[PDB]
Amino acid sequence: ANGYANSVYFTNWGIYDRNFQPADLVASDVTHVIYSFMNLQADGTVISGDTYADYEKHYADDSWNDVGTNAYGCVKQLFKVKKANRGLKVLLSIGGWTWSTNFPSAASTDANRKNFAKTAITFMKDWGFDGIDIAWAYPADATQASNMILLLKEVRSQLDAYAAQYAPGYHFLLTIAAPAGKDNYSKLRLADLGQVLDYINLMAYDYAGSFSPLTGHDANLFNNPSNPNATPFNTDSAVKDYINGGVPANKIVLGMPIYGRSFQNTAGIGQTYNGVGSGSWEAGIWDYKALPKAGATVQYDSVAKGYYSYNSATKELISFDTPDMINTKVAYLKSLGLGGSMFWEASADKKGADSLIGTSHRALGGLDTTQNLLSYPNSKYDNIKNGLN
């Protein structure tokens, strides 16, 4: 890359209740959109989890009387974004937290890995995307960890062979969503990942919530020796283990949450709580654009480098990232020579000055300007093949 990544996950289910369409992305701030998620079968078959959201939904300017076989849905909307933002690459993300059960089987044989690569790359080239993100949560043992590398090498091989025929000289990107927990990342073939991948999206969040015995920072940088119950994990120990394990610092993109985890009936950070309570869309989880709530004040753990709203009246504490937290995390990643910022996920961000993604863009400065691809002469969709001209 020729600068920092400022990447964001865009969810295909966000077009429904969250009403967040690809045209809603503030694309000027973004180097990579990671389109989430494709589903996976045990025989390695990559499939759409929602054909409506992916390529069937007609937006206002999508003709119900055009000739040929055409892609609509988020695929055409994201191609429009790529046309208007030549420095913005779109990656196809496969798996995710809820859809990782079939990865061990999918990676387990040469035939299943070839089927995974062919079906994944078929979507990528039909939809007019710039690469593939493997979101396998998470390889469980040495067999799975080894098979993950064999799978990534098969995808890399087939991407290079596809480019040689249908996008000569273009480098399709291959990335993973990577775990921040040592129980998970100690099982990975880190040096192999460091060699085969363009980027490792480090999921440096979900450190504490309903699954934690006490209130914790969700995404803190450092251990708090004074209040260690508040920092059950920290980003810094994971980042150092990834780099020392053989992932080059410049390939590590530091993930950051655009949501908070709430703790109810609590005196503060590192302490007893009872329930996670309500959420924006699911129990205990709040969109950043809904934070801080009315009457809550933002406190700061300057050791663990964690911000959290506290409401003295309601006793609600919400761990979440603020614009100031983003400035600190950007200073941190530049200090370690990391590849940039990643965000989960786009729909929850604020607009204007208080955009976490926009704060990251201004704090990073020199963003990746590597050009995307607009030429898909082997796309089965006439409108994509014709670049929506």
Ligand X SMILES: CC(=O)N[C@@H]1[C@@H](O)[C@H](O[C@@H]2O[C@H](CO)[C@@H](O)[C@H](O)[C@H]2NC(C)=O)[C@@H](CO)O[C@H]1O
Ligand Y SMILES: CC(=O)N[C@@H]1[C@@H](O)[C@H](O[C@@H]2O[C@H](CO)[C@@H](O[C@@H]3O[C@H](CO)[C@@H](O[C@@H]4O[C@H](CO)[C@@H](O)[C@H](O)[C@H]4NC(C)=O)[C@H](O)[C@H]3NC(C)=O)[C@H](O)[C@H]2NC(C)=O)[C@@H](CO)O[C@H]1O
Q: How many residues bind ligand Y (CB under 6 A)?
A: 23
Is residue 17 part of the contact set for Zn ion (CB under 5 A)? Answer: yes
Other Cβ atoms within 10 Å of 174 Cβ, number = 19
One of 14, 22, 44, 209 touching ligand X (CB under 6 A): 209
198 binds Zn ion (CB under 5 A): yes
Of these partners, ligand X, Zn ion, ligand Y, none, which one is at the site of residue 207 (CB under 5 to 8 Å by kind)? Answer: ligand X
**Is 171 an interacting residue with respect to Zn ion (CB under 5 A)?**
yes
* Using rule CB under 6 A, residue 37 touches ligand Y: yes
| Binding site partner of 198, from ligand X, ligand Y, Zn ion, none, Cβ cut-off 5-8 A by kind | Zn ion
* Whole-number CA gyration radius for the chain: 21
Q: 345 preceded by cis ω (within 30°)? A: yes
CB of 361 to Zn ion, least distance (A): 6
Task: Name the H helices within the chain.
Answer: 51, 73-84, 103-106, 110-127, 142-166, 182-185, 190-196, 235-244, 323-335, 356-364, 382-385
Comparison of 29 and 50: residue with beta carbon closer to ligand Y: 50
Binding of ligand Y at residue 211 (CB under 6 A)? no
Residue 126-165 contact track with ligand X, rule CB under 6 A, x = bound:
----------------------------------------
Whether the bond into 72 is cis, omega within 30 of 0: no
**282: contact with Zn ion by CB under 5 A:** no
- A 10 A CB-CB count for 281 gives 14
367 binds ligand Y (CB under 6 A): no
SS (H, E, C) 88-132: CEEEEEEECHHHCCCHHHHCCCHHHHHHHHHHHHHHHHHHCCCEE
Does 259 engage in binding with ligand Y (CB under 6 A)?
yes
- The option from Zn ion, ligand X, ligand Y, none interacting with 135 (CB < 5 to 8 A, set by class) reads ligand Y
Amino acid at residue number 23: A
Nearer to ligand X, 201 or 309 (CB): 201
Best CA proximity match to 130, nearest among 375, 333, 389 = 375
CB contact at 8 A, 77 and 21: yes
Among 233, 286, 307, 376, contact with ligand X (rule: CB under 6 A): 233
Is residue 203 part of the contact set for ligand Y (CB under 6 A)? Answer: yes
In order of 16, 122, 312, 330, the CA distances from 19 in angstroms are 5, 28, 33, 29
- Scored b (16 or more CB within 10 A) or e, 33-70 reads bbbbbbbbeeebbbebbbeebbbebeeeebeeeeeeeb
User: Of 242, 307, 230, 310, which Cα lies nearest the Cα of 272?
Assistant: 230
Phi, psi of 72 (to 5 degrees): -115, -135
Give the residue closest to ligand X by C-beta. 181
The encoded tokens of residue 344 equal: 């989960």
180 binds, among Zn ion, ligand Y, ligand X, none (CB under 5 to 8 A by kind): ligand X
Nearer to ligand X, 136 or 376 (CB): 136
Q: Which is nearer to Zn ion, 301 or 368 (CB)?
A: 368
Do the Cβ atoms of 120 and 155 come closer than 8 Å? yes
210 sits near ligand X (criterion: CB under 6 A): yes
Say which entry of Zn ion, ligand Y, ligand X, none residue 343 contacts (CB below 5 to 8 A, set by partner kind): none
Q: Which of 96, 108, 117 is nearest to 46 (CA)?
A: 117
Rule CB under 5 A: is residue 114 a binding residue for Zn ion?
no
Q: By CB under 5 A, which span of 39-47, 169-177, 271-279, 285-293 interacts with Zn ion?
A: 169-177
Q: Which of ligand X, Zn ion, ligand Y, none does 211 bind, CB closer than 5 to 8 A by kind? A: ligand X
Nearer to ligand X, 16 or 211 (CB): 211
- Cα(12)–Cα(37) distance, integer angstroms: 7
Q: Is the peptide bond prior to 211 cis by the omega test (within 30 degrees of 0)?
A: no
User: Among ligand X, ligand Y, Zn ion, none, what does residue 233 contact (CB within 5–8 Å per kind)?
Assistant: ligand X
Between CA 117 and CA 121 the distance in angstroms is: 6
Does residue 97 belong to the site contacting ligand X (CB under 6 A)? yes
Q: Give the residues lining the site for ligand Y (CB under 6 A).
A: 13, 16-18, 37, 49-50, 95-99, 135, 137, 177, 203, 206, 259, 281-282, 285, 344-345
Q: Give the residues lining the site for ligand X (CB under 6 A).
A: 97, 180-181, 184, 203, 206-207, 209-211, 233
Q: Give the residues lining the site for Zn ion (CB under 5 A).
A: 17, 171, 198
